[PDB]
Design a protein around this ligand. Structure first.
Ligand SMILES: Nc1ncnc2c1ncn2[C@@H]1O[C@H](COP(=O)(O)OP(=O)(O)OP(=O)(O)O)[C@@H](O)[C@H]1O
Ligand SMILES: Nc1ncnc2c1ncn2[C@@H]1O[C@H](COP(=O)(O)OP(=O)(O)O)[C@@H](O)[C@H]1O
Ligand SMILES: Nc1ncnc2c1ncn2[C@@H]1O[C@H](COP(=O)(O)OP(=O)(O)O)[C@@H](O)[C@H]1O
Ligand SMILES: Nc1ncnc2c1ncn2[C@@H]1O[C@H](COP(=O)(O)OP(=O)(O)O)[C@@H](O)[C@H]1O
Lengths: 434, 434, 146, 48, 426, 443
């Protein structure tokens, strides 16, 4: 019914990276078709990621436009799943106006390593029923409720002070951590939502807690190595986690954190989870930034890098020099290259079928045939874009299944590049600038 | 009255119920094949299913590209966000170029919330607080329609105290917000002294208490910006707000993640609903190659709005490449991710209809013999120039004491204000003097 | 001698703009929603922090358990403005001396048969040889930071 | 400085010229509200 | 005589774009001459500005150097008068280091459109005759005009205000009743003995006055930016105002218009030297000129077909065709001997100098041999030579002196080529 | 266990006592003259005689210049600072290029300085202000001392203190059953909290309890603390421990690096010499390894001419892989190694050389037995051959993916049929470029 904040897009139907237990790729599964050789390679590097034994590995995905390079990376990210970091950026995002291209890459690396820690807790969480105090040091008692139980505490002096500072009253829902002592309001009980009729600028209604009043347990927290660096940058640095406002972390801090994390894994207090960094459109990193990757991929703790690129032999940014993929040779031999292949008619049918299943559309077999030709005379991505429009024409026509005529109407309204650029030549002197 | 401006005559796409275009309707004329296509885009935006899908309007200057883009904003109406921007806006001095793209992509997605606005106002008849410390405060109000009593919380009482409210003052309370406003002393006490510094107002003639149902619009971008940096908290009254000047900042990825997760909670609870809107990046050819590359990532994201682009260039050089030409000034890599709608030059009869529609919008009477002359001059020059001469011609007709444009008025104005084509002919002749 | 002293006439704002013109006031009903839908509300912190569904399951605010910070302190520090920051900073200076003594003499053996991080264990800045606590504690390094 | 012809506006600007709140003013002027509270009685301590 | 800040400068003699009621430009008036076509066209645009109904409209003034194309715009800024916003900037002034290039234009538009309101005030004005206080406190005072008297009992907040400002008998004062501010206007002439002096007011003591007030749309935006935003309206620190604030304020001012609580006063932006905006800046004006709250904008330029800044492309005026279709071009023409002579006369009157009819004649010929601005500069110099000589009227030999001291560019270029290798880097 | 990286096997230079190289030792093989050369450089760094002298390791991609630079750090060991950098680090947004270089030159010089710490700590059992038998003349009472009784897990004792302590013991909210400490070099007292013994005396209290101190009431130790000169630069240029508006404002504001003045560097040099003279502190001049030098700008190189001639500078090691490139920050000026001739005059070049087919085989075996992999000889004789047709790095790159494929197919060692399958999955730089050239109309 109600439209959530996430909805149907490009790399949406891929729900993994379709492989048997022997890492043989199936012809069609987990929303992917064809690309068998690259999908085996993707499987092997995925196994390498999951082991996490060896650092600083890198892979490059290469091949012509509309052949599944970002599809394979967006598939692999889901096969890997959450619980393991995976950070994706476009190449063009490192050109910050407040830190160097080195720092933008450094943070993108440190953001793809996770630390896991155990923590031992007890907390109290309930609706407050009555606070009572008397003057003989002060003495008092306080009563807590939860749907399962009602109970009393014989609180000491500093708690009596703290409850007055935080101005608790009956019907407030509160938490305390006993080890630390600090009080924290969560809101007021729905059962009390009427003892006033003009409420303050912010008060918030919550349900009364349930279960045991003083729950005691282990919890496990996973925290990215980057955040440990940021919290140690300045006296209230954590604010910069949200603000983005953090300015070239001093090198001796990152060194100190590495020493401490290494100590905790030897003690067994923590463990390190290696993740991935994906840079799409990597061909527009700059020559200074490439020369930094030459030593980033050599630390005792670095992610695996996956990079994707669409370029032939072409000029490296920041220089005159031609090279393969627009990448320097001193990096291309630290990499390991996976190449896609263009699709057949057979694959082009199957991938259109998966898109109509994802976008919830029915088409005639004739219509799939005609669309397949259009998606082979012109780019795959154009044929994928016709199907939504074909459906919208069909609804206006009061149909239900898309026919050949719905394809031909949309094909008349919306041009591809090749038809467009031809019409631009027939009137060229009316356009601006060449 | 409202000022007349460059597009105020267009009121919608003006398609019939079958989706086909009418010759002249809703303040547009001509362009059937090109503006039937916008009909399909409007259905796509109203469908809410899709994300990141994108459109390019292409064609020479003065052929209707921004008129059609604004016509779409009419057909959607103020329920749905429509954010216009100019390519040249990307080059901020506070934040990186891709940050400006990402902010504007967020602005085009709206939360729509409902609440009952509830207001109490009138002279304060009494204040009485209510054990050890204030549990609640009773307040009485009076107007020329009656009396009421209310039961305030201590947060509201603190706000009344801060406004320096006392009995006999005239007050506005808004019960939802916790907003409190003093409006002066009630004039029944205006004789307490002959000179005193207060301002006295009459007792209100309206109701003591009023209720409305109101709808609040807020975008995801508003949540990002409000939550990232500490909210200042200053109703002035606090000199610390003077020291730290504001600036824009790179919003971190983590924060947008949490905001997505909290908004999903509220649209599950029925408290809010979501409206995916439109971002209109006009003047697109002014984007840099870095930015064009970042769009390949943002248009794939399964959260993004519909994006509309427009451009008027032929085969010009892509900004930031110093070398590479491409159609419409857009990289081929991105031009394969958009559907293209072509836009066509007007025949003389079309321009006559546009001129008449502008005249009757702008408020000017024009005789047939004069309108035929602006029609001719439009073929020699350009439509955007004939539509400029209407107002100055009217202003001379008025100075010469006549109600309506006649041939000698437009003929006089033609000799007095030049076109870019005919002025360029002067610059080619007096070449050595400038 | 003394400098030349000057005042301009004060900048006049109309009642109309002072009543109907500040966005801070006329949008106060709308603004409240942006503070309600905040991820920094103590409600959401508790639910994110302790009431997860996976065993491994990433959540923000996990760092709060290893700095000294509580959800109410964090919400306060995000909404109350620069005075909260100043007072929170003042207390943090006082706290750092106590952390230094514990960290620098109380070091031997694990508290737990070697599991668990303690509260405050991401606060590393005290460990540096030239940190103010250490440089106060050691009489001689005090002379090299003059 | 700003002038506006409204009783409530004049109440606001008076606060700003005195200093916004006792806490915020003490914070700048004496360093912290704790230090302000001590400073009042430092007349009575040998080693302040 | 005493010196203003505003001494005589290059356009000081222009006191209005002078025309008859049918917008016919008379041959010389209000300090300016010639340019019949351009001054008539400028008159039509001045009528559009004044009527105000149409937004987002622009005109380009173009022609050779020294043909009055700043002059007509400077005259038009006088003729439009105060109380209708007019803002003037050089095109090189938007290249800020502190603020984006597109922000500076956005802000320049909004300085030039005003919101206007009227409001009412209770005011006391009179001579104080007696003032009394006690040991809360209660006091009393008496006030006088030429026409009536009163005694008032004082409440507490007025006692604080009157005791703070040390009011004394015989002072003439004004009181903002609602707020407690005292303004003092000096002392009554009849108690000037035993400080500035004035006669006591006429009419009644307590007047309900009504005051019309207006604020630039920009100045609303800046006040809303910060704890005391109005200081950035002086200090210039108004860095990149958030566009969602401007989005809000436009919708608020639109409802103030429709509910009749305020009315909007359009204005003019005179962006001078336009040929040196970048292509990025042109591409913004392209689309800024389409708002209901755009001003009229007037652009001046003196450039032939030229390369537009930030590109290799060439186009008329040094501006892209993309922007030139938004606007109408008014073209100025160079002067004849009659016009040149007459302009020199007008400058002589403004500078307070007299010269012989032959002196006007030779200076006119110089003006045609070397462009007007040279000749106009000779006038002041010639008068200084006459004063050194203890003369009075300028004679031909005083002009021929100055013509030998101070060179024009054409002669200076000729006298540079004979020493070609002594200058650097040619 | 610790993860594995591209240099994890390099453990030293592997030389005889005579300083000649071994064919294979401490993880390295081959390059004997270059390893012998680095042998000399290690002795130069250990000598402590010299400043500013510098070396450039020059040679093609994947010939061992980074490995050799890392090996020098193993020979020196942990006690002397070795500071790594890449040429691309100089281009900061906070600070000028020449300051980045000057900071790194001051990072590669260390002090080792040693001092006693003494502290008293324990749970406070008593505060016993002690009166004299008679007051001084005219006074009501006089206190000679306070007794404080402290206890720990080892025992209890009384400390006798000056009466002036008593003011401090009420500024701190000390009460009996708290645990406190006293800094023996300063006399100041600080509270830690109520002892853990009392954690049960209410159901809730708003204080964190702290465990009883273990060991004696009075504690002493000597510690050796080690810091770079760059740490003294920064700690003086932006102080800490604020109780003033300047400090606290400076600490709420966003911190940023600043161009440290040559005066401060001067003053720090003056005072550390006083301590070195008094035998309080030991200097350890170290090494700065500027890798990927060919990324520096001509402004940077022209600063290094001054920096390397300073009497203070560390030993600098440079590296490069470029042929006759254009120098960055000039239009047309080609030069060897991508470096200006007038800097290249101030460095001793060490030349590094391509490996033979036998040497690659020997290195690939050393990778496999450190990456934790077993390989059959008939497979290694394939992988060394692939290396000879392609590159060392690519032939080493295949080891882990081959192992994974072997493990999925149920075998404990790499075999021939594994490596010739992995070679079909992943291309190299040479073969990929061929595919591009045959298809150049579609990229
Ligand atoms: N079909 C039409 N019907 C009515 N008015 C139109 C039509 N086409 C264009 N106009 C009007 O003529 C002008 C055309 O502006 P247009 O949309 O062509 O800008 P453009 O050159 O396409 O793009 P840009 O906004 O970038 O300059 C406007 O006044 C517009 O309202
Ligand atoms: N093998 C595949 N299986 C499923 N969808 C695919 C496959 N290859 C490509 N696609 C789809 O085709 C489109 C283009 O693929 P993408 O990987 O983004 O192109 P590119 O290789 O140029 O980066 C996307 O909608 C993507 O989901
Ligand atoms: N019609 C005129 N009336 C008076 N002064 C004029 C006239 N035309 C030009 N000038 C004089 O020429 C100068 C201004 O030159 P102008 O052409 O307006 O500037 P620009 O060449 O920069 O466009 C001033 O000295 C001005 O007095
Ligand atoms: N002499 C050597 N002995 C052992 N391993 C070596 C030797 N030379 C290079 N290697 C290894 O081969 C790879 C390439 O060496 P590296 O130092 O990165 O080369 P370079 O800096 O010349 O590009 C690394 O994995 C390195 O550890």
């Amino acid at each position: 019914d109600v439209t959530r904040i996430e909805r149907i897009g490009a790399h949406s139907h891929i729900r993994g990276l379709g492989l048997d237990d022997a890492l043989e790729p199936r012809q069609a599964s987990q929303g992917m078709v064809g690309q068998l050789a690259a999908r085996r390679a993707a499987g092997v590097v995925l196994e390498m990621i999951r082991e996490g034994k060896i650092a600083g590995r890198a892979v490059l995905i290469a091949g012509q436009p509309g052949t599944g390079k970002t599809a394979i990376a967006m598939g692999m990210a889901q096969a890997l799943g959450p619980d393991t970091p995976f950070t994706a950026i476009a190449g063009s995002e490192i050109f910050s106006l407040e830190m160097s291209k080195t720092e933008a890459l450094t943070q993108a690396f440190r953001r793809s390593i996770g630390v896991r820690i155990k923590e031992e807790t007890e907390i109290i969480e309930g609706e407050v029923v009555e606070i009572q105090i008397d003057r003989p040091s002060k003495v008092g008692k306080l009563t807590l409720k939860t749907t399962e139980m009602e109970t009393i505490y014989d609180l000491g002096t500093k708690m009596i002070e703290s409850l007055t500072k935080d101005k608790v009253q009956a019907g407030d829902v509160i938490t305390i951590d006993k080890a630390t002592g600090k009080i924290s309001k969560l809101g007021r009980s729905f059962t009390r939502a009427r003892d006033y009729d003009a409420m303050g600028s912010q008060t918030k209604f919550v349900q009364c807690p349930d279960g045991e009043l003083q729950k005691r347990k282990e919890v496990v927290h996973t925290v990215s190595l980057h955040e440990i660096d940021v919290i140690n940058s300045r006296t209230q640095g954590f604010l910069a986690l949200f603000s983005g406002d953090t300015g070239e972390i001093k090198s001796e801090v990152r060194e100190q954190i590495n020493a401490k994390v290494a100590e905790w894994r030897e003690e067994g207090k923590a463990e390190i989870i290696p993740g991935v960094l994906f840079i799409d459109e990597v061909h527009m990193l700059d020559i200074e930034s490439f020369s930094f990757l030459n030593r980033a991929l050599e630390s005792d703790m670095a992610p695996v890098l996956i990079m994707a690129t669409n370029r032939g032999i072409t000029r490296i940014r920041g220089t005159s020099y031609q090279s393969p993929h627009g990448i320097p040779i001193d990096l291309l031999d630290r990499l390991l290259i996976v190449s896609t292949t263009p699709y057949s008619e057979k694959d082009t049918k199957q991938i259109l079928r998966i898109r109509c299943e994802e976008e919830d559309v029915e088409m005639s077999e004739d219509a799939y045939t005609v669309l397949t030709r259009i998606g082979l005379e012109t780019s795959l991505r154009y044929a994928i874009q016709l199907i939504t429009a074909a459906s919208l024409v069909c609804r206006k026509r009061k149909g239900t299944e898309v026919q050949v005529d719905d394809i031909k109407r949309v094909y008349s309204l919306f041009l591809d590049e090749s038809r467009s650029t031809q019409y631009m030549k027939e009137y060229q002197d009316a356009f601006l600038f060449n | 009255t409202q000022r007349i401006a460059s597009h105020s005559h267009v009121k919608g796409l003006g398609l019939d119920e079958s989706g086909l275009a009418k010759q002249a309707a809703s303040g547009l004329v001509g362009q059937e094949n090109a503006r039937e296509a916008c009909g399909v885009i409007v259905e796509l935006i109203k469908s809410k299913k899709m994300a990141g899908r994108a459109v390019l309007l292409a064609g020479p200057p003065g052929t209707g590209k921004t008129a059609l883009a604004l016509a779409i904003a009419q057909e959607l109406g103020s329920k749905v966000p429509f954010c216009p921007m100019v390519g040249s806006e990307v080059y901020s001095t506070e934040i990186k170029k891709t940050e400006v793209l990402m902010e504007n992509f967020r602005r085009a997605i709206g939360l729509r919330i409902k609440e009952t606005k509830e207001v109490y106002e009138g002279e304060v008849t009494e204040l009485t607080p209510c054990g050890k410390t204030i549990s609640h405060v009773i307040i009485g109000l009076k107007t020329a329609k009656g009396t009421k009593q209310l039961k305030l919380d201590p947060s509201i009482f603190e706000s009344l105290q801060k406004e320096r409210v006392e009995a006999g003052d005239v007050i506005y309370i808004e019960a939802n917000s916790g907003a409190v406003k003093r409006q002066g002393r009630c004039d029944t006490y205006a004789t307490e002294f002959d000179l005193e510094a207060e301002e006295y107002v009459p007792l209100p003639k309206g109701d003591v208490h009023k209720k409305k149902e109101i709808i609040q619009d807020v975008t995801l971008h508003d949540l990002d910006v409000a939550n990232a940096r500490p909210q200042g908290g200053q109703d002035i009254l606090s000199m610390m707000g003077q020291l730290m000047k504001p600036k824009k900042t790179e919003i971190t990825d983590k924060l947008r993640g949490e905001i997505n997760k909290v908004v999903n909670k509220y649209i599950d609870q029925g408290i809010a609903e979501l409206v995916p809107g439109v971002l209109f990046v006009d003047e697109v050819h002014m984007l840099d190659i870095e930015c064009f590359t970042y769009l390949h990532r943002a248009l794939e994201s399964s959260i993004a709005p519909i994006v509309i682009f427009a451009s008027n260039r032929g085969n010009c050089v892509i900004r930031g490449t110093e070398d590479i030409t491409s159609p419409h000034g857009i990289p081929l890599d991105l031009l394969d991710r958009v559907m293209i709608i072509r836009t066509m030059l007007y025949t003389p009869q079309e321009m006559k209809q546009i001129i008449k529609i502008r005249a009757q919008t702008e408020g000017i009477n024009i005789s047939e013999e004069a309108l035929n002359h602006l029609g001719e001059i439009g073929t020699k020059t350009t439509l955007r120039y004939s539509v400029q001469l209407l107002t100055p011609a009217n202003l001379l007709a008025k100075i010469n004491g006549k109600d309506s444009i006649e041939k000698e008025h437009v003929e006089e104005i033609s000799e007095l204000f030049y076109d870019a084509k005919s002025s360029a002919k002067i610059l080619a002749d007096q070449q050595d003097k400038y | 001698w003394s400098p030349f002293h000057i005042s301009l006439k004060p900048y006049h704002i109309s009642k109309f703009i002072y009543r109907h013109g500040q966005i801070r006031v006329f949008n106060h009903s709308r603004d409240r929603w942006l503070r309600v839908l905040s991820p920094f509300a103590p409600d959401y912190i508790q639910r994110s922090l302790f009431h997860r569904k996976g065993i491994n399951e990433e959540s923000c605010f996990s760092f709060l358990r290893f700095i000294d910070i509580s959800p109410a302190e964090m919400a306060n520090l995000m909404l109350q403005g620069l005075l909260a920051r100043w007072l929170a900073l003042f207390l943090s200076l006082k706290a750092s001396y106590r952390l230094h003594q514990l960290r620098s003499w109380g070091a031997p053996e694990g508290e737990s048969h070697q599991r668990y991080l303690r509260n405050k264990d991401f606060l590393l800045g005290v460990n540096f040889p030239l940190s103010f606590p250490n440089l106060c504690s050691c009489p001689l390094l005090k002379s090299l930071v003059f | 400085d700003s002038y506006c012809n409204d009783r409530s506006a004049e109440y606001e600007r008076r606060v700003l010229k005195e200093g916004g709140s006792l806490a915020a003013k003490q914070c700048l002027l004496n360093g912290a509200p704790e230090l302000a509270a001590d400073w009042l009685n430092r007349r009575s301590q040998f080693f302040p």
